[PDB]
């Protein structure tokens, strides 16, 4: 099985190993597209405290194709990490970052107390809002929230509040420590998929009867070096009767001719059983390396002793041989 070199990986590392995250009230989004989604750096990592998929199991995810993958990132308290899930409610789930009940994706989070703390009030969350958020919405306005019946007129006051509240993140705080949260949302649209996981390839064995899968084509046969060249964009060659002639190898870009695995009729050459029960066997149109062994044009003949002396023909084999 052969697939081409992966030189275009999805930037999960850029999202996860970022020097800075956004506030949850103003969470960031980056689109992941037209790349290979290698999740082996996410699900085999012991550094994450939270790793839960609400869409599809990680064991299948690394073999699925999507049109778009979105990585939503923000910093919240450890006690609020549990709110980042479908069906949940709370100050973060309702006013800062809402996931739909039918969310398809994975929520990954880890402790960032060794960096994102001081108090560090750079990270903020929405405390008040007129109504909750729609799935994947964002609200970064600073309009003063009116809790009472008296117009706020743009300022704080009796039953009037600035909508945001900062996090008091300090190095000495588990529930009040900062956590970096990344949500990976995966979708399949009517559009062609653009992001697939990596595919593994096997080594290529030459001059042997094998099954094979090259890119998107399959078949069986023997792979040998070709003496023909293809145009720069061509992936495989085809014969007159529309059968595969050759394939261009995805990693080496070398061309390998494909021949059918040796086959042919097997016939028994025998004197009449009235005089002898000794027989010779002829394998038609095959090599003796594939099956008193005599290689001829008719096939590989076993049991008959080849001699230099010619005689009038008795039992015909073919191609001048009797």
């Amino acid at each position, epitope marked *: 099985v052969r697939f081409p070199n992966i030189t275009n990986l999805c930037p999960f590392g850029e999202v996860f190993n970022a020097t800075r995250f956004a506030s949850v009230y103003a969470w960031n989004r980056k689109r992941i597209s037209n790349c290979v989604a290698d999740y082996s750096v996410l*699900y*085999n*990592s*012991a*550094s*994450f*405290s*939270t*790793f*839960k998929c609400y869409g599809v*199991s*990680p*064991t299948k995810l690394n073999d699925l194709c999507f049109t778009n993958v979105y990585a939503d990132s923000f910093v919240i308290r450890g006690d609020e*990490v*549990r709110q980042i*899930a479908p069906g*949940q409610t709370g100050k973060i789930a309702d006013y800062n970052y809402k996931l739909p009940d039918d969310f398809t994706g994975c929520v990954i*989070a*880890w*402790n960032s107390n060794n960096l994102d703390s001081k108090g560090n009030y750079n990270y903020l969350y929405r405390l008040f809002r007129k109504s909750n958020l729609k799935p994947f919405e964002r609200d970064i306005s600073t309009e003063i929230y009116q809790a009472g019946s008296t117009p706020c007129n743009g300022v704080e006051g009796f039953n009037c509040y600035f909508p945001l509240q900062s996090y008091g993140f300090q190095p000495t705080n588990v529930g009040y420590q900062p956590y970096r949260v990344v949500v990976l949302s995966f979708e399949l649209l009517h559009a062609p998929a653009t992001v697939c996981g990596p595919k593994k390839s096997t080594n290529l064995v030459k001059n042997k009867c094998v099954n094979f899968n090259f890119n998107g084509l399959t078949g069986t046969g023997v792979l040998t070096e070709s003496n023909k060249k293809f145009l720069p964009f061509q992936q495989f060659g085809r014969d007159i009767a529309d059968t595969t002639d050759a394939v261009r190898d995805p990693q080496t870009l070398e061309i390998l001719d494909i021949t059918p695995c040796s086959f042919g009729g097997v016939s028994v050459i025998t004197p009449g059983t009235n005089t002898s029960n000794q027989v010779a066997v002829l394998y038609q149109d095959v090599n003796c390396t594939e099956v008193n062994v005599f290689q001829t044009r008719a096939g590989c003949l076993i049991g008959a002793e080849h001699v230099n002396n010619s005689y009038e023909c008795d039992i015909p084999i073919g191609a001048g041989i009797c």
Partner: antibody
Amino acid sequence: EVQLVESGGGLVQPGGSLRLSCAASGFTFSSYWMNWVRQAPGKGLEWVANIKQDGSEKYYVDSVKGRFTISRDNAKNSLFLQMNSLRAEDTAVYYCARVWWLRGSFDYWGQGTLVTVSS
Amino acid sequence: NFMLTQPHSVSESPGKTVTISCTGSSGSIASNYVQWYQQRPGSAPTTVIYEDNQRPSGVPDRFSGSIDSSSNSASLTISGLKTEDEADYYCQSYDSSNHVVFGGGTKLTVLG
């Protein structure tokens, strides 16, 4: 068809040491996480150690830290546990198991090798 | 560090449904996947339920479960109890304070 085969149990004195092994086939070792899980008689299950697919990293439960070493050989198709300074409290049945991914399930289990510590 | 605990004695009549629970402390059980294992006497525990609600081949649809995130707990239910279901059941999850965390086990008896 995936199978796990264990050996190396028996009676050891306190402060002594031994190596347990879990030979296996039906899969490529370098593609899977390998673990040891312990169960003392009359007790529930507890985790002892975890080793990464390529052996590049190792994890231990605090109770065996500094005493037990988890190691693997992907060419010999076998998982090993080297247990040093064994204590009376370490008397237990040791199981080997295969894990698809770090936070996933233990898909295959051995039968369990009994180690008894007594002077 | 995060730990799991279970009830010792759980039992129910054959043909009926029994609930086996597991609770967490010093961390959140719902932040990771929960597995359930069944150990019949004489051998090793094997997976019955994994990743909250999935099951391996050989396990019937009588085995299912969920995680109650607001209660920091999880459970499985076994419907249609058979006398072959007598076993020691275990819960397992993952944390950063304790990599692989197992519960103390539940003894399930089918009241035949």
